[PDB]
C-alpha cells in the first residue's frame, strides 16, 4: 500500500516530509508565539515574535529585532503550535487567523504541496512548475478512497463528487474559482482525466473510444480559445461548463460542452506583449510547404493581426509542436480531412482580411488600391473578390424601405472588415463546439457531474466591455459560494430550530451584482441596452447616463475625477476602472448584411454552414431589435447558475502565488488578498462552529 509506504512517490510528492530531532525539540517546546506586523503600514507582511508575558487582556512579545511590544489578546494573531505546520485540513488549526492560514499554506507550498483542504472545500496554490502527481498510478491510489484517508488532491475531491453522485443519485458540480492564471484550467483538465479513468470502460477493439475523445476535446478548444495575455501565457478567452455524463450503472455515457462568450475582439487587436489565439501561430509554424502555399501564408511579422503586439512567441512553447497536437486531437474527435482544411482556410482567410489596407479616394468615401490581400482572402474563402470589395466599402442598407448604397470612409471600412473577421472566427468557434458535442453525446444520460472552467477575474491598464462581462461572471460565482457556504447553511439551521445564533460573515456581492445586471432600478447592462437601441446615442451619452444614475448614489460605483470616459466598479476582488470606448458597438455586435450575403454564397462547405445554419448564423430578435450581447450573456449566465443550483457543488479555490508567473515565490500580499476576498477563513469558521 503506497498510502503507508513512506518510500512511495505518493509519500514523496503528496505527504509532508518527516521532521528531524532538532525539529522535534522545537515541536515539544513550551514557548508561545504570535504573528505580528513589524510595519503597521504593511499589514500583510508578518514576522514571528515570542510571547514573554501576559496580563488579563494583553500579550507582550519580542520582535525579531531588539524591542518588545504589547497587544490586546482579542487583537492578537497567535501562532499555532508548530505541530500544525503542514496540516492537510486547516479546520484543524487551534488559532484560525490570516497569518496562521497563510503560514500553513506557505509551509506546504515550500514542499511542493499545492493542495490543502480548508474545511469542506479544497484550496490550490499554483506551483508554476511541473509536479509528478497526476500519473495513472496516482489516479489509482485515490480511486475510491474517503477524503480523510488520502492526502489533499484534485483527484480526491473528484472521487468524492463521484461517490456522492452514485450514493445520493443526485447531480454534482465542481466549481473551480480563481483569478487569471491561478490554475482553474489545469485543475479542470485533471478532474476530467480522473473521472474518465475511474469511470470509463476498458473493453478492447471497440471500447473506451469515448473517454479518449472526451480528453481530446480540450486541446482543440484551447488552440482556438486560449491566448497569451499579460497574466497568463495560456489564458482561456471563453468560459466553459463541461458536463460529464454517466449511465445508471455509474459509467461514462458521454459529455457536452457549453462555451461562454469568446473574446471575438482579440482576433483583430492584442495589446503590447500579448498574442492572438494560439491557432494563428500553430498554423503559420506547423503547416507544410504545400499548405503554406495553397494558403498564401508567410510569417507572423507579415500579418497585421499578428505583428502589432511585438510578441509572436511564448517562452517554452513550440507552436509547430502544438499544431501537431491540435490536428491529432481533431482526428481522434472526428474532423474529416476536408473539414480541417476548411478550418485552416478560414484561419488563413482571417489573416489575409486583416491585411486589407483601405485608403481615401478623391472624396470622403474609401477605396482599395492594392487588392493582393483582398484577392488572397477571397481565394481561400471561396468568395467573389468584387462582391466582397463592394460589400466592405459600399454596403447596402435600407433608408425607410429604400435601398441605399453606403460609401464607408477609411475608418468605417476597416471596422466593417473587423466585424466580418470576428463574426467569422466567432462562428467557427461555435461550430467546433457543436461538432465536438455531437460526437460526445451518444447516449441518454442518467446523471452528470458539471465541471465549470470560467475565465478568471482580470485587470489590465485598459479594461473594456470584455473585462466587465468576465468580472461579472466571477462576481456571480463568488456569490454562489457565499450563498451555499453561509446563507443556505444558516437558513437551514434556523429552519430546523437547532438553537443557532445567526452569524454575519460579511460576505455579500449582491450590491455589485445588482449594479451590473440590475433591472429595477436599471443597472449598468440595462442602461447599456437602452442607449444601445437609441439612435442618437454615443459612448459619451452612455457614460454621462451611467454617472447620472450611479455617481454618488451607488456605493459600488465611482465616477473618477481624473477621467471622463471611465467608471469604476467595486468587485469582490477589487475596484476596476472601465473604459467606455466602443461599448455601444460591442453590445450591438453589428455586421453588414451585404457581407453575410457575400459569404452565404461561398464555395466552401464549412464557411457556408457558418452563414446558413440558424443556430450559428441566426440572431434572436428582442422585438424590433436583435438581442444585445449583454442581454444574451446575462441570460445565459442565469441558466448556468440555475443549473448549478440543481446539483450538489464542490468548490476548488485556485490561488495564484505571485503576479510574475514564477515558481517558488509565494507573495503574502498577493496571496492574502485572495484568501480574504474569496472568503476562505470565513469558509473555515462556518465548518468549524456549525453542523456540516
Ligand atoms: N497544477 C499545476 N501544475 C503545473 N502547472 C500549473 C498548475 N496549475 C497551473 N499551472 C501553470 O499555471 C498556468 C496557468 O494556469 P491556468 O490553469 O491556465 O489558469 P486559468 O485557467 O486559472 O486562467 C498553466 O498554464 C501552468 O503553467
Ligand atoms: O487567465 V484564465 O482566463 O483562463 O482565468
Ligand atoms: Mg483557463
Name the residue of 183, 189, 456 to mutate for ligand 1: max ligand atoms within 8 A of Cβ: 183
Q: Is 621 exposed, middle or buried (0-12, 13-18, 19+ CB in 10 A)?
A: exposed
Which of 377, 375, 383, 372 lies closest to 352, judged by CA? Answer: 377
What's the angle, vertex CA 261, arms to CA 256 and CA 265, rounded to 5?
140
Instruction: Determine the atom of ligand 2 nearest the C-alpha atom of 181.
Output: 1
Residue nearest atom 25 in ligand 1 by C-alpha distance = 234
Question: From the CB of 657, is ligand 1 less than 6 Å away?
Answer: no
CA–CA separation, 353 and 299 (whole Å): 15
Count of CB atoms within 10 A of residue 537's CB?
15
Residue nearest atom 15 in ligand 1 by C-alpha distance = 183
Dihedral angle of Cα 12, 16, 20, 23, to the nearest 10 degrees: 160
Cell 510571547, residue? 51
- What are the percentages of helix, strand and coil residues in the chain, rounded to 5? 45, 15, 40
Question: From the CB of 181, is ligand 2 less than 6 Å away?
Answer: yes
Question: From the CB of 384, is ligand 1 less than 6 Å away?
Answer: no
Cell 473551480, residue? 176
Question: From the CB of 177, is ligand 1 less than 6 Å away?
Answer: no
DSSP code for 627 = P
Instruction: Determine the atom of ligand 1 nearest the C-alpha atom of 232.
Output: 14
Calculate how far, in angstroms, residue 663's C-alpha sits from the geometric centre of ligand 2.
18
What are the angstrom distances between the C-alpha of 481 and each of 59, 321, 451, 470, 543? 36, 39, 15, 17, 32
CA–CA separation, 104 and 523 (whole Å): 41
Question: From the CB of 128, is ligand 1 less than 6 Å away?
Answer: yes
DSSP letters along 9-54, please? Answer: HHHHHHSPPPP-HHHHHHHT----EEEE-SSSS-TT--EEEEEEEE
- How many contiguous H segments (helices) and E segments (strands) does the chain have? 26, 23
Q: Is 364 left (phi over 0), alpha (psi -120 to 50) or beta?
A: alpha
> The domain at 459-589+620-646 falls in which architecture?
Up-down Bundle (1.20)
Calculate how far, in angstroms, residue 454's C-alpha sits from the geometric centre of ligand 3.
7
Q: Is 517 exposed, middle or buried (0-12, 13-18, 19+ CB in 10 A)?
A: buried
What's the angle, vertex CA 569, arms to CA 122 and CA 180, rounded to 5?
35
- Edge-to-edge strand ranges of the sheet holding 58-62: 68-72, 58-62, 47-54, 33-36, 77-78
* Nearest ligand to residue 115 Cα: 1
Name the residue of 124, 181, 460 to mutate for ligand 2: max ligand atoms within 8 A of Cβ: 181
Helices assigned H by DSSP within 483-589 = 488-496, 510-517, 524-532, 539-550, 583-588
CA–CA separation, 479 and 358 (whole Å): 47
Identify whether the C-beta of residue 592 lies closer than 8 Å to the C-beta of residue 407.
no
What are the angstrom distances between the C-alpha of 104 and each of 64, 186, 544, 688? 20, 23, 48, 17
Calculate how far, in angstroms, residue 329's C-alpha sits from the geometric centre of ligand 1.
20
DSSP code for 522 = B
Which of 210, 216, 225 lies closest to 255, judged by CA? Answer: 210
Helices assigned H by DSSP within 247-353 = 278-286, 289-294, 319-333, 337-353
CA–CA separation, 236 and 221 (whole Å): 9
Instruction: Determine the atom of ligand 2 nearest the C-alpha atom of 457.
Output: 5
Strands 58-62 and 68-72: antiparallel
Name the residue of 186, 234, 236, 467 to mutate for ligand 1: max ligand atoms within 8 A of Cβ: 186
Strand partners, 453: 240
Helices assigned H by DSSP within 534-576 = 539-550
CA–CA separation, 211 and 197 (whole Å): 8
Mind spelling out the 3-state secondary structure of 133-159? CCCHHHHHHHCCCCCCCCCCCHHHHHH
Identify whether the C-beta of residue 679 lies closer than 8 Å to the C-beta of residue 505.
yes
Calculate how far, in angstroms, residue 328's C-alpha sits from the geometric centre of ligand 3.
21
Which of 355, 386, 347 lies closest to 373, judged by CA? Answer: 355
Strands 359-360 and 366-367: antiparallel
Task: Give the rounded distance of the alpha carbon of 311 from its chain centre.
Answer: 22
Cell 480526491, residue? 156
* Nearest ligand to residue 234 Cα: 1
Cite the active site residues.
Answer: 180-181, 185, 232, 235-236, 456, 458
CA–CA separation, 48 and 35 (whole Å): 5
Calculate how far, in angstroms, residue 176's C-alpha sits from the geometric centre of ligand 1.
12
Where do the domains of the chain lie?
Answer: 1-31+80-458+590-619+647-692, 32-79, 459-589+620-646
DSSP code for 628 = P
Resolution reading in Å: 2.4
Residue 215 phi, psi (nearest 5): -65, -35
Instruction: Determine the atom of ligand 2 nearest the C-alpha atom of 231.
Output: 1
Calculate how far, in angstroms, residue 184's C-alpha sits from the geometric centre of ligand 3.
6
CA–CA separation, 124 and 563 (whole Å): 38
Identify whether the C-beta of residue 445 lies closer than 8 Å to the C-beta of residue 247.
yes
Residue nearest atom 4 in ligand 2 by C-alpha distance = 236
CA–CA separation, 172 and 195 (whole Å): 12
Question: From the CB of 184, is ligand 1 less than 6 Å away?
Answer: yes
Cell 502555399, residue? 293
C-alpha cell at 382: 471561396
CA–CA separation, 455 and 221 (whole Å): 14
Name the residue of 124, 187, 236 to mutate for ligand 2: max ligand atoms within 8 A of Cβ: 236
Q: Is 341 exposed, middle or buried (0-12, 13-18, 19+ CB in 10 A)?
A: middle
Question: From the CB of 473, is ligand 2 less than 6 Å away?
Answer: no
Cβ contacts of 400 within 8 Å, gap of 6 or more: none
Residue nearest atom 3 in ligand 2 by C-alpha distance = 455
DSSP letters along 446-506, please? Answer: SEEEEEEEPPPP---SSB-HHHHHHHHHHHHHHHHHHIIIIIHHHHHHHHHT---------
DSSP code for 668 = H
What's the angle, vertex CA 124, arms to CA 121 and CA 125, rounded to 5?
145
Question: From the CB of 188, is ligand 1 less than 6 Å away?
Answer: no
Question: From the CB of 232, is ligand 2 less than 6 Å away?
Answer: yes
Name the structure determination technique.
X-ray
Binding-site residues for ATP, in ranges, read 178-185
Q: Long-range CB contacts (< 8 A, 24+ apart) of 140-144?
A: 141/2, 141/3, 141/10, 142/194, 143/197, 143/198, 144/198
Question: From the CB of 126, is ligand 1 less than 6 Å away?
Answer: yes
* Nearest ligand to residue 655 Cα: 1
> The domain at 32-79 falls in which architecture?
Roll (2.30)
DSSP letters along 68-134, please? Answer: EEEEEGGG-EEPPPGGGTT-SBGGG-SS--HHHHHHHHHHHHTTT--EEEETTEEEEE--SS--S--
C-alpha cell at 358: 483601405
C-alpha cell at 645: 443550483
**R_g of the chain computed on alpha carbons:** 28
Helix (H) or strand (E) run with residue 375 in it: helix 372-381
Calculate how far, in angstroms, residue 212's C-alpha sits from the geometric centre of ligand 2.
25
Residue 158 phi, psi (nearest 5): -70, -50
C-alpha cell at 75: 487583537
CA–CA separation, 602 and 588 (whole Å): 26
Question: From the CB of 456, is ligand 2 less than 6 Å away?
Answer: yes
Question: From the CB of 474, is ligand 1 less than 6 Å away?
Answer: no
Binding-site residues, in ranges, read 178-185
Identify whether the C-beta of residue 552 lies closer than 8 Å to the C-beta of residue 565.
no
Calculate how far, in angstroms, residue 654's C-alpha sits from the geometric centre of ligand 1.
9
Amino acid at each position: 500500500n503506497p498510502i503507508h509506504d513512506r518510500t512511495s512517490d505518493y509519500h514523496k510528492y503528496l505527504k509532508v516530509k518527516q521532521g528531524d530531532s532538532d525539529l522535534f525539540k522545537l515541536t515539544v517546546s513550551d514557548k508561545r508565539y504570535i504573528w505580528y506586523n513589524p510595519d503597521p503600514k504593511e499589514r500583510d507582511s508578518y514576522e514571528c515574535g515570542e510571547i514573554v508575558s501576559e496580563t488579563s487582556d494583553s500579550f507582550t512579545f519580542k520582535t525579531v529585532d531588539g524591542q518588545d511590544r504589547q497587544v490586546k489578546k482579542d487583537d492578537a494573531n497567535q501562532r499555532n503550535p508548530i505541530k500544525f505546520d503542514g496540516v492537510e485540513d486547516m479546520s484543524e488549526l487551534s488559532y484560525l487567523n490570516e497569518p496562521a492560514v497563510f503560514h500553513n499554506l506557505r509551509v506546504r507550498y515550500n514542499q511542493d504541496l499545492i493542495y490543502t483542504y480548508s474545511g469542506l472545500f479544497l484550496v490550490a496554490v499554483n506551483p508554476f512548475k511541473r509536479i509528478p502527481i497526476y500519473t495513472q498510478e496516482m489516479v489509482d491510489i485515490f480511486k475510491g478512497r474517503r477524503r480523510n484517508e488520502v492526502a489533499p488532491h484534485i483527484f480526491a475531491i473528484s472521487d468524492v463528487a463521484y461517490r456522492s453522485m452514485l450514493d445520493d443519485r443526485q447531480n454534482q458540480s465542481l466549481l473551480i474559482t480563481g483569478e487569471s492564471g491561478a490554475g482553474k484550467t489545469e485543475n479542470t483538465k485533471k478532474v476530467i482525466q480522473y473521472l474518465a479513468s475511474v469511470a470509463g470502460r476498458n473493453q478492447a477493439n471497440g471500447s473506451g473510444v469515448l473517454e479518449q475523445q472526451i480528453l481530446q476535446a480540450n486541446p482543440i478548444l484551447e488552440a482556438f480559445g486560449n491566448a497569451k495575455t499579460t497574466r497568463n501565457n495560456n489564458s482561456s478567452r471563453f468560459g466553459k461548463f463541461i458536463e460529464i455524463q454517466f449511465n445508471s450503472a455509474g459509467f461514462i455515457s458521454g459529455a457536452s460542452i457549453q462555451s461562454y462568450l469568446l473574446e471575438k475582439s482579440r482576433v483583430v487587436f492584442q495589446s503590447e506583449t500579448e498574442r492572438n489565439y494560439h491557432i494563428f501561430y500553430q498554423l503559420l509554424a506547423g503547416a507544410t510547404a504545400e499548405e503554406k502555399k495553397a494558403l498564401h501564408l508567410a510569417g507572423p511579422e507579415s500579418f497585421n493581426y499578428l505583428n502589432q503586439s511585438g510578441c509572436v512567441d511564448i517562452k517554452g512553447v513550440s507552436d509547430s509542436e502544438e499544431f501537431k497536437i491540435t490536428r491529432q486531437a481533431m482526428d481522434i474527435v472526428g474532423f474529416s480531412q476536408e473539414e480541417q482544411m476548411s478550418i485552416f482556410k478560414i484561419i488563413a482567410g482571417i489573416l489575409h482580411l486583416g491585411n486589407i489596407k483601405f485608403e481615401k479616394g478623391a472624396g470622403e468615401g474609401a477605396v482599395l488600391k492594392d487588392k493582393t490581400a483582398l484577392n488572397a482572402a477571397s481565394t481561400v474563402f471561396g468568395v467573389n473578390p468584387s462582391v466582397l470589395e463592394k460589400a466592405l466599402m459600399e454596403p447596402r442598407i435600407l433608408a425607410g424601405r429604400d435601398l441605399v448604397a453606403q460609401h464607408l470612409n477609411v475608418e468605417k471600412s476597416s471596422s466593417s472588415r473587423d466585424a466580418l473577421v470576428k463574426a467569422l472566427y466567432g462562428r467557427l468557434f461555435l461550430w467546433l463546439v457543436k461538432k465536438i458535442n455531437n460526437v460526445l453525446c451518444q447516449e441518454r444520460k442518467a446523471y452528470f457531474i458539471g465541471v465549470l472552467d470560467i475565465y478568471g477575474f482580470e485587470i489590465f491598464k485598459v479594461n473594456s466591455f470584455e473585462q466587465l462581462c468576465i468580472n461579472y461572471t466571477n462576481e456571480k460565482l463568488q456569490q454562489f459560494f457565499n450563498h451555499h457556504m453561509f446563507k443556505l447553511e444558516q437558513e437551514e439551521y434556523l429552519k430546523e430550530k437547532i438553537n443557532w445564533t445567526f452569524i454575519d460573515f460579511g460576505l455579500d456581492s449582491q450590491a455589485t451584482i445588482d449594479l451590473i445586471d440590475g433591472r429595477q432600478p436599471p443597472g449598468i447592462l440595462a442602461l447599456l441596452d437602452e442607449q444601445s437601441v437609441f439612435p442618437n446615442a454615443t459612448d459619451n451619452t452612455l457614460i454621462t447616463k451611467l454617472h447620472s444614475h450611479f455617481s454618488k448614489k451607488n456605493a459600488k460605483y465611482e465616477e473618477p475625477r481624473f477621467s471622463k470616459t471611465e467608471f469604476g466598479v467595486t468587485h469582490y476582488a477589487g475596484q476596476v476602472m472601465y473604459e467606455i470606448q466602443d461599448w455601444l458597438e460591442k453590445n450591438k455586435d453589428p455586421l453588414q448584411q451585404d457581407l453575410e450575403l457575400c459569404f452565404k454564397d461561398s464555395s466552401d462547405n464549412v464557411v457556408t454552414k457558418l452563414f446558413n445554419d440558424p443556430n450559428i448564423a441566426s440572431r434572436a430578435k428582442k422585438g424590433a431589435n436583435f438581442i444585445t450581447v449583454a442581454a444574451q450573456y446575462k441570460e445565459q449566465l442565469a441558466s448556468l447558475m440555475a443549473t448549478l443550483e440543481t446539483t450538489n457543488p464542490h468548490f476548488v479555490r485556485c490561488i495564484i502565488p505571485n503576479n510574475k508567473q514564477l515558481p517558488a515565490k509565494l507573495e503574502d500580499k498577493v496571496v492574502l488578498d485572495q484568501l480574504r476576498c474569496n472568503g476562505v477563513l470565513e469558509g473555515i469558521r462556518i465548518t468549524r462552529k456549525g453542523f456540516p
